[PDB]
Design a protein around this ligand. Structure first.
Ligand code: HEA
Ligand code: HEA
Ligand SMILES: CCCCCCCCCCCCCCCCCC(=O)O[C@@H](COC(=O)CCCCCCCCCCCCCCC)COP(=O)(O)OC[C@H](O)CO
Ligand SMILES: CCCCCCCCCCCCCCCCCCCC(=O)O[C@H](COC(=O)CCCCCCCCCCCCCC)COP(=O)(O)OCCN
Ligand SMILES: CCCCCCCCCCCCCCCCCC(=O)OC[C@H](COP(=O)(O)O)OC(=O)CCCCCCCCCCCCCCCCC
Ligand SMILES: [Cu+2]
Ligand SMILES: [Mg+2]
Lengths: 153, 91, 76, 90, 104, 266, 141, 47, 86, 114, 504, 72
């Protein structure tokens, strides 16, 4: 009734095997308090800014950057929809062509935070000069605790 | 009678009658090895031509009947195509 | 025609090396992973993974011990 | 005359003569005109070619150093050696 | 080898043989190449001055002075700002940005 | 004119065995015919009205210019302007043209080998694509291979024969065998259950077999033109030898075409 | 990060791969400087010392087997000395020997880039055995 | 005595093949070239 | 009296290459090229030393925030310890 | 009263569950909104398949997309390996490719068996 | 009638030289619009049109590649100088030589007409799909048909050249006594015959993709296949344009040094090794398209081998000048400049061969600076070296030496100040084929646009160098065109010369 | 005559100055005699100027033509 509860506590005091088993039961019950897995997803476009302000760079500036954590192995799958393009960021040493039908992968590990600028490196038409690339590099804890919460529905 | 060919002919001798017939029969052996049988099967093929039919309609897959530009330079259907297979009104 | 001089055989050693490497690279492509005309090649996961790792490791395994030691430059 | 084996029958020999032209005995070059271009190699180097021009009615002339001497002679026919004189086989 | 040299020197009599490396004197060459360079500079200046249909607002002196106030600093939408190109401008590794420095 | 032959013998013919031509109008006309036919072809691609007629007009002009050029060459052969070394140079030029056509076909079959070996996700990685019923090797294509091998051997007969009747009959047999290779390729092009617009398989099949059929037609016409020069004077010279060389080249090309497309299903 | 005015060499780097590329470039430039210096100095000296005002008549020198073999064999050693680090750099581009932390699907259009992601975020109790022992001593008394 | 009426290389056919064609073709190429240039430069593509 | 070809070349060694000193000039060129190349490589090595010092000082900074993070976590553990013991 | 010397295994198991739950609801919460300081986040992406060693990964995308529907046909709808296949192809395949493949499947233009 | 119906090789070669000069003028005009749009940040004279800028760079690249250097070196100096140099009375096929020339004005006309149709062919000179396929209209078809006609022209010319060298040599003259220009032209013909039909097949596939709705390079095709075929053509193409320059530089340097060429067999073997290696290295243009690392590995290792034969050729030229009696004239300065400045164009090619470094500088101005060193200063200097060398023989006109030196110094200064700053732009990451750039790239762009105007001025000054000639009589030479009168007769070598081997 | 095969083969046996030439290019010592065209240096500079004009003005006309179609 309640002494059997106290007798179970006394058996916790006495038997090390029962103590370890109930410790494992506590561990199993605490894992049932952990929130379940949630999906992080987005789909946004990046356009060049027509008019810049001081502190920004002309031609190279976009409206929506790409946010990537540092010290983390990132898989980048580069592709295209209509013609050929090329994703080039000279700071990161990445330049891979975007081919309609292919899915070219890059493995990349960023050592420091910063802002990295790039442009398209394959002739794609009239506005080949106006498709810039900006990558925003932050710490992994900021990316995992603050940025990904912006994409949770 | 005084052409350039006849003028230079004694300085270009031909490299040396029944040997020609021997060579002709040697090549004619390989000719009749495949000659009459190929012609016979092709004459058989010319009479078994546009008589059989296929009614195997094909669904409009993305790789079938590519129309990046509308139509063809000579019309709607392809050239040499009298019996179009890809299906229209795909149920 | 003429007698090849002593330079041209010192030329012909890396030229023969390059021609042999070109022939080998041409030959080993239809014995690789993505050159399969079926979706049923990948339903056998053991053989597919073994063949693809064999294609990975060849000519790379001669470089792993210097990849691990950052031998990526003439000087250090 | 040099051995006419492996020589084309229309190469007009005098070029295939068995003589070294000296000052007191030059090699007589036949020609259809008053001047003609001929080519002489270096006696010490097969790879080097000197082209010279011989003129009708001139002294013997040497083109390369330590080479043959030459005198041009205007003729109406040049013996097309290979069927002209080895068909004679005199 | 000498006779073709002497023949080419007779068919080209304006080429001098005086015993110097630059056979044509520099008093002839330098003024004319200077005049050609001057004409090229005039064409370049004419292109710069009269052949522009849009001058960017990021090159005006107000933009330039307001940019020189800021320096080589990039903003972030998720973090404090950061100094751009830290190796060539010799920022030490302890300092990441302007605002995170907070000078002593 | 009567001293033109005398001047030629005095200055060119008696001095070297090579052939020096008088001035000719056909290269310029052939070049501007190519200009007109290229304009017509570009207009016919995009369905511009009276564009196909312009392309046909330019092609007809190129054909007429080439026919008159070749008639002039045949006339120059019949008047004994070509020595033996000139005919050897003719065969050398035919060998160079054969090498160029060979690399054209190498580039064409490179596409078949590339596209057939590794199908893409756009095809749902299946070669040949679903719906496409490929043409088999155990049928009319084997009859074509037999007929073209017989044409190879019959053209080989006329190269070595010395009886003129044997040469004429062998050439006529080779030409008639070549015409049966094309009249049956037309039946393949009519019975085939796919189009040049249906998948890269249909694309590569039709383009490569069409280029081969065009070369077969050119070789058959060249063998026909070499026979009529022999039907007149019982001598053809370089016209017989070069046409036989071109025909053997076409035969060798069919081996690669059959063994890559029909057997390898590429 | 971003380019600068009057810049000569590469930009600054944020990965070890790009710094390896730049170091390989500077290692190649080490050999190129010596090659260009030797060519330019020897050309200048040959030009000045063999002008016709210095030379009465030239010398016959068509071949020299030793020097031909020397300038054939020295650049081949330079080629193979360059090639092995470049081959090592090419093969080190795949770095899948870790756990990947992120997928980014970059799509190139006319005329804007498009960025995608679809991952899953899950949480894990940081060092639970200390909390397990805390619960153990909370339940034992 | 070595040419017939059927012969393609008959010298009685030399004027028609080598002189009349060199002017008829020479003006037809011009009249086709100008029309083709106008058709390409000032034409509207329907495909 | 015939037309003689003139002496057109010296033999290699007794003309105007006896005073050239080919090996000396090659040694001078290689010395100058190696000196310039070693100056360039010294500059590159100095830059790499600066990059290594930068990343070392960055790691020295980065160790400090995460020590004070786990110290704060241990302080929260010491609070929750007496939360279940009071 | 049933003591520990007289209780069975199932009643003892229920008592263990009650003893654990009544205190861990105080520690972590009934839902778990108190562990946020002791929780470590981690992002899950599709793993490296050794079957696909090249840089072009469109075949990896296509194979995972087909394996999901094979898992759905064979091992029910909610088997964990089926969600492994789903979260592996969603981590790799661009969404335009995916929606094209479902509209092909809806049209009847899919060459797969299942 | 003389210049429309010609069968002589000397007239057809001169027609090639004039047509190449016209193509150089057109390309120089198209190159000033590029450097005048690129002088300042923002929008220049093109009014912010990017399609027009793409059309301009496409037309400029195609014209300067195919219609300037190729007809000048291969069709120009080759047709004029080959039968004289070997002793042939004519070409082997004299009417084929005329249709070789007469297919070039229709090709240039179609290329210039493509600019005025629709919005033009803005694709680049490589014409990569699906950008070439997406273009509505007719202009891209005209540009590709221009490419077909030019390719057929080059194939027919190579056929004539190869039958001429093989079968019409002078008696007694083997393939050992030909000068190095003949060897260069013969190896160039071999490369043309082997490489151009691959381009013809690739462009036929492009036409069928554009117009016939086929599936060569499309959704269901393979877009890397076009780059494979195109660069398998295109890398032998750049050695086609550079081997006659090697031959010309050998002839010029040998002449004015009073010495034969050092290491003749080594020179021929180096040219042959360059010719053979040019067919197996082609995917060094495709490092960033997503090829497997073994392919990249091989093409990196194989591309660096081409440095050794070129280094032997350069050191052999320097040994040819060594221990001579050298007289520095205007063609001599165009060959010393070739040797000193082609080295700067090849050392950056070594850097571009290494694929790790090429990940940073692909499609930047480092590439542009490299290939304007090897073309504007290797091939153009070779063209201009032979104009001041053989010009009085070919045209009959002399030249003023002072104005030619003025022209040389202007060109030399204007090209070392146009493309030397383009190295620093490419190392800092400025992309190719762009007209609006970032604000920090302004200084080197201004310097490069300053150099282009000096180049244009040197183009203008070249027209003023011609003058009347003085004609003399020849006795002896080392090559067969320097015993002829200037100009030679319509049938030069009235008697076929023979080479007599002495008793030795 | 005038259409014989000998006319096709050996050409037409013309001797001397062709129509408006001042020198025999076919059978004289030089195939190009530039000091014998009357007013040679005037026509030479006229042709050079026309060549420079066309080769430097065709691209500008193409720029003007495309930009005049957008400005409509
Ligand atoms: C033959 C090769 C060649 C030559 C000589 C040149 C010459 C010049 N080029 Fe370039 N260029 C290319 C080949 C060449 N180019 C190619 C292939 C492209 C790429 C196109 C594409 O991307 O699709 C390009 C593109 C290109 C760019 C890159 C633009 C971009 O990325 O968008 C630039 C930028 O500065 C440039 C400028 C110049 C300048 C200022 C010259 C100056 O040298 C000006 C020329 C001056 C000369 C003196 C040369 C003319 C020669 C003669 C007139 C001699 C003729 C004489 C006789 C026949 C007797 N051109
Ligand atoms: C004249 C034509 C010409 C010539 C001769 C060359 C010669 C070379 N080229 Fe280039 N190239 C082009 C024309 C040419 N190229 C063009 C037009 C492009 C751009 C195409 C486009 O996209 O539009 C291009 C681009 C190009 C690329 C592709 C880069 C890219 O587009 O991303 C590469 C990569 O390997 C390359 C390398 C080389 C090499 C190694 C040589 C070698 O042959 C050079 C060899 C010479 C030397 C190396 C110097 C001499 C050697 C010595 C003095 C000995 C010392 C040397 C050592 C010790 C190593 N060049
Ligand atoms: C239309 C183009 C027709 C070209 C015809 C041709 O090239 O034929 C020549 C032969 O060419 C060859 O050597 C073979 C190559 C054939 C090239 C065919 C091109 C087809 C292009 C499609 C004939 O040589 P020639 O015109 O110089 O006359 C020579 C004379 O009789 C004696 O000197
Ligand atoms: C300049 C160089 C040349 C470039 C220009 C060439 C372009 C010509 C395009 C012609 C394509 C016609 C294709 C066509 O409809 O015919 C197919 C045969 O193709 C062929 O046989 C094509 C032969 C010519 C190839 C080019 C068969 O017709 P189909 O495939 O519709 O038949 C389906 C029956 N079931
Ligand atoms: C088809 C592409 C190949 C055609 C090659 C033409 C070679 C012409 C040649 O070598 O001339 C010498 C040759 C002279 O021969 P001879 O009788 O020995 O002087 O020319 C001819 O008479 C052959 C002319 C070609 C015949 C018509 C070609 C029909 C092709 C398809 C229409
Ligand atoms: Cu290349
Ligand atoms: Mg590229």
């Amino acid at each position: 009734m309640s002494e059997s509860k106290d007798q179970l506590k006394e058996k916790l005091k006495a038997d090390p095997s029962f103590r370890a088993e109930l410790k494992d039961r506590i561990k199993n019950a605490l894992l049932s308090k952990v929130p379940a897995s949630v999906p992080i997803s987005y789909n946004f476009d990046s356009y060049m800014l027509t008019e810049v302000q001081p502190g920004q760079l002309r031609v190279l500036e976009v409206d929506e950057r790409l946010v990537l954590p540092t010290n983390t192995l990132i898989r980048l799958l580069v592709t295209a929809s209509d013609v050929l393009h090329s994703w080039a960021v000279p700071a990161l040493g990445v330049k891979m062509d975007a081919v309609p039908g292919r899915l070219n992968q890059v493995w990349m590990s960023i050592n420091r935070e910063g802002v990295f600028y790039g442009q398209c490196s394959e002739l794609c038409g009239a506005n080949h000069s106006f498709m810039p690339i900006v990558v925003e590099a932050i710490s992994p804890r900021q990316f995992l605790t603050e940025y990904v919460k912006k994409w949770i529905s | 009678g005084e052409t350039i060919d006849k003028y230079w002919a004694p300085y270009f001798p031909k490299p040396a009658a029944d040997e020609a017939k021997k060579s002709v029969n040697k090549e004619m052996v390989g000719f009749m090895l495949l000659g009459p049988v190929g012609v016979a099967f092709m004459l058989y093929d010319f009479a078994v031509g546009l008589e059989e039919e296929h009614h195997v309609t094909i669904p409009p897959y993305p790789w079938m009947r590519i129309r990046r530009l509308p139509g063809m330079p000579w019309g709607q259907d392809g050239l040499f195509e009298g019996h179009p297979r890809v299906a229209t009104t795909w149920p | 025609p003429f007698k090849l001089p002593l330079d041209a055989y010192i030329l012909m050693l890396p030229i023969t090396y390059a021609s042999a490497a070109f022939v080998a690279m041409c030959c080993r492509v239809p014995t690789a992973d993505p050159e399969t005309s079926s979706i049923a090649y990948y339903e056998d996961e053991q053989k597919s993974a073994a063949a693809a790792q064999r294609y990975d490791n060849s000519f790379k395994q001669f470089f792993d011990a210097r990849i691990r030691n950052h031998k990526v430059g003439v000087f250090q | 005359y040099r051995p006419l084996g492996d020589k084309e029958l229309w190469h007009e020999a005098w070029m295939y003569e068995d003589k070294f032209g000296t000052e007191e005995d030059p090699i007589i070059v036949p020609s259809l005109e008053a001047e003609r271009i001929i080519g002489v190699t270096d006696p010490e180097d097969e790879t080097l070619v000197v082209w010279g021009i011989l003129k009708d009615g001139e002294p013997p002339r040497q083109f390369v150093e330590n080479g043959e001497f030459y005198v041009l002679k205007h003729v109406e026919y040049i013996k097309k050696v290979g069927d002209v004189l080895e068909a004679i086989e005199g | 080898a000498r006779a073709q040299i002497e023949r080419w020197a007779a068919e080209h009599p304006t080429a001098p043989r005086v015993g110097r490396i630059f056979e044509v004197p520099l008093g002839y060459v330098v003024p004319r190449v200077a005049a050609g360079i001057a004409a090229a500079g005039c064409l370049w200046y004419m292109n710069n001055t009269f052949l522009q249909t849009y001058r960017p607002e990021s090159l005006s002196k107000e933009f330039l002075e307001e940019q020189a106030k800021i320096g080589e600093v990039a903003q972030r939408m998720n973090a404090p700002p950061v100094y751009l190109n830290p190796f060539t401008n010799r920022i030490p590794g302890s300092i990441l940005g302007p605002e995170d420095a907070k000078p002593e | 004119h009567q001293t033109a032959k005398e001047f030629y013998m005095e200055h060119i013919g008696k001095r070297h065995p090579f052939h020096v031509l008088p001035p000719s109008p056909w290269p310029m006309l052939a070049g501007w015919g190519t200009y007109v036919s290229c304009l017509g072809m570009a207009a016919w691609f995009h369905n511009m009205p009276t564009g196909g007629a312009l392309m046909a007009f330019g092609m007809a002009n190129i054909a007429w210019t080439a026919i008159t050029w070749w008639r002039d060459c045949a006339i120059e052969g019949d008047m004994g302007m070509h020595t033996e070394v000139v005919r050897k140079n003719f065969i050398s030029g035919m060998w160079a043209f054969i090498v160029s056509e060979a690399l054209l076909f190498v580039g064409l079959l490179w596409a078949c080998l590339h596209l057939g070996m590794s199908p893409s996700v756009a095809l749902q990685m299946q070669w040949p694509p679903v719906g496409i019923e490929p043409i088999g090797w155990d049928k009319r294509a084997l009859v074509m291979s037999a007929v073209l091998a017989a044409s190879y051997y019959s053209a080989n007969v006329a190269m070595v024969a010395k009886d003129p009747k044997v040469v004429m009959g062998a050439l006529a047999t080779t030409i008639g065998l070549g015409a049966m290779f094309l009249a049956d390729q037309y039946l393949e092009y009519n019975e085939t259950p796919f189009t040049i617009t249906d998948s890269p398989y249909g694309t590569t099949f039709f383009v490569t077999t069409g280029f081969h059929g065009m070369h077969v037609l050119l070789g058959s016409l060249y063998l026909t033109a070499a026979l009529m020069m022999y039907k007149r004077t019982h001598n053809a010279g370089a016209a017989l030898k070069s046409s036989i060389l071109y025909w053997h080249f076409v035969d060798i090309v069919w081996i690669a075409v059959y063994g890559i497309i029909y057997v390898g299903q590429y | 990060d971003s380019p600068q005015p009057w810049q000569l060499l590469f930009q600054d780097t944020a990965t070890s791969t790009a710094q390896a590329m730049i170091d390989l470039h500077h290692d190649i430039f080490f050999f190129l400087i010596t090659v260009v210096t030797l060519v330019f100095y020897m050309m200048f000296q040959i030009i000045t010392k063999f002008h016709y005002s210095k030379v009465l008549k030239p010398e016959k020198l068509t071949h020299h087997t030793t020097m031909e073999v020397i300038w054939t064999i020295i650049p081949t050693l330079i080629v193979v000395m360059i090639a092995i680090p470049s081959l090592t750099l090419i093969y080190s581009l795949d770095q899948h020997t870790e756990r990947p932390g992120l997928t980014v699907k970059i799509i190139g259009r006319q005329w804007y880039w498009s960025y995608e992601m679809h991952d899953h975020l899950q949480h894990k109790l940081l060092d639970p055995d200390r909390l397990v022992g805390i619960a153990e001593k909370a339940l034992v008394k | 005595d070595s040419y017939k009426a059927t012969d393609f290389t008959n010298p009685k056919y030399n004027y028609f093949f080598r002189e009349l064609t060199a002017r008829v073709q020479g003006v037809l190429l011009t009249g086709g070239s100008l029309y083709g240039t106008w058709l390409v430069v000032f034409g509207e593509a329907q495909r | 009296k015939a037309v003689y070809a003139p002496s057109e070349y010296f033999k290699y060694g007794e003309g105007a290459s006896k005073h050239f000193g080919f090996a000396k000039h090659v040694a001078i060129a290689m010395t100058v090229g190696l000196g310039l190349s070693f100056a360039w490589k010294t500059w590159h090595w100095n830059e790499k030393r600066y990059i290594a010092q930068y990343y070392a000082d960055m790691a020295r900074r980065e160790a400090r925030e995460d020590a004070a993070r786990k110290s704060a976590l241990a302080d929260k553990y010491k609070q929750l310890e007496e939360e279940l013991l009071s | 009263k049933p003591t520990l010397e007289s209780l069975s295994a199932d009643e003892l198991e229920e008592l263990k569950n009650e003893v654990v739950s009544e205190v861990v609801d105080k520690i972590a919460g009934e839902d778990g909104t108190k562990l946020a300081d002791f929780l470590e986040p981690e992002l899950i992406t599709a793993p490296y398949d050794p079957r696909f060693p090249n840089r072009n990964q469109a075949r990896h995308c296509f194979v995972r997309f087909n394996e999901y529907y094979k898992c759905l046909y064979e091992r029910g709808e909610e088997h964990p390996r089926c969600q492994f296949y789903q979260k592996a192809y969603q981590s790799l395949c661009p969404s335009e490719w995916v929606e094209s493949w479902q509209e092909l499947r809806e049209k009847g233009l899919w060459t797969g068996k299942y | 009638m003389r210049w429309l119906y010609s069968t002589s090789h000397k007239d057809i070669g001169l027609l090639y030289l004039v047509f190449a000069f016209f193509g150089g003028l057109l390309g120089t005009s198209l190159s000033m619009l590029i450097r005048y749009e690129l002088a300042l940040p923002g929008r220049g004279l093109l009014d912010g049109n990017g399609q027009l800028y793409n059309v301009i760079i496409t037309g400029h690249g195609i014209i300067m590649l195919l219609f300037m250097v190729m007809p000048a070196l291969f069709g120009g100096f080759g047709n004029w100088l080959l039968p004289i140099m070997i002793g042939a009375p004519d070409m082997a096929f004299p009417r084929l030589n005329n249709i070789s020339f007469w297919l070039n004005p229709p090709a240039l006309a179609l290329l210039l007409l493509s600019t005025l149709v629709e919005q033009g062919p803005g694709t680049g000179w490589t014409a990569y799909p699906p950008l070439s396929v997406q273009h509505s209209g007719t202009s891209v078809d005209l540009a590709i048909l221009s490419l077909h006609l030019n390719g057929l022209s080059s194939i027919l010319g190579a056929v004539n050249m190869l039958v001429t060298v093989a079968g019409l040599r002078a008696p007694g003259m083997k393939l050992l006594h030909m000068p190095l220009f003949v060897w260069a032209i013969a190896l160039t013909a071999v490369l043309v015959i082997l490489a151009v039909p691959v381009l013809a097949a690739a462009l036929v596939m492009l036409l069928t993709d554009r117009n016939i709705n086929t599936a060569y390079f499309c959704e269901s095709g393979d877009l890397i296949l076009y780059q494979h075929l195109f660069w398998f053509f295109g890398h032998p193409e750049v050695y086609i344009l550079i081997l006659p320059a090697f031959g010309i530089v050998s002839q010029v340097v040998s002449f004015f040094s009073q010495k034969p060429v050092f290491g003749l067999t080594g020179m021929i073997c180096a040219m042959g090794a360059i010719s053979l290696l040019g067919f197996i290295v082609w995917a060094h243009h495709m490092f960033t398209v997503g090829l497997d690392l073994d392919t990249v590995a091989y093409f990196t290792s194989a591309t660096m081998i081409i440095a050794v034969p070129t280094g032997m050729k350069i050191f052999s030229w320097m040994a040819t000048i060594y221990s001579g009696r050298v007289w520095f004239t205007t063609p001599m300065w165009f060959a010393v400049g070739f040797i000193c400045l082609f080295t700067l164009g090849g050392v950056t090619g070594v850097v571009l061969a290494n694929a790790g470094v090429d990940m940073l500088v692909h499609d930047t101005y480092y590439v542009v600076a490299h290939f304007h060193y090897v073309l504007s200063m290797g091939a153009v200097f070779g063209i201009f070296a032979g104009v001041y060398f053989w010009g009085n023989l070919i045209t009959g006109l002399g030249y003023h030496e002072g104005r030619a030196m003025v022209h040389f110094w202007l060109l030399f200064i204007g090209v070392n100040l146009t493309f030397f700053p383009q190295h620093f732009l490419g190392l800092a990451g400025m992309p190719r084929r762009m007209f609006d750039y970032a604000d920090c790239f302004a200084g080197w762009n201004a310097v490069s646009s300053f150099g282009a105007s000096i180049s244009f001025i040197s183009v203008i000054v070249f027209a003023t160098t011609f003058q009347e000639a003085v004609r003399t009589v020849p006795r002896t030479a080392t090559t067969l065109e320097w015993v002829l009168l200037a100009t030679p007769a319509h049938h030069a070598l009235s008697q076929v010369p023979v080479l007599r081997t002495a008793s030795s | 005559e005038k259409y014989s095969h000998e006319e096709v083969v050996y050409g037409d046996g013309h001797h001397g100055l062709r129509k408006g030439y001042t020198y025999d290019f076919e059978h004289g010592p030089h195939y190009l005699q530039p000091e014998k065209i009357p007013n040679f240096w005037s026509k030479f500079y006229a042709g050079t100027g026309a060549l420079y004009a066309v080769g430097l003005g065709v691209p500008l006309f193409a720029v003007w033509w495309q930009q005049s179609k957008l400005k409509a």
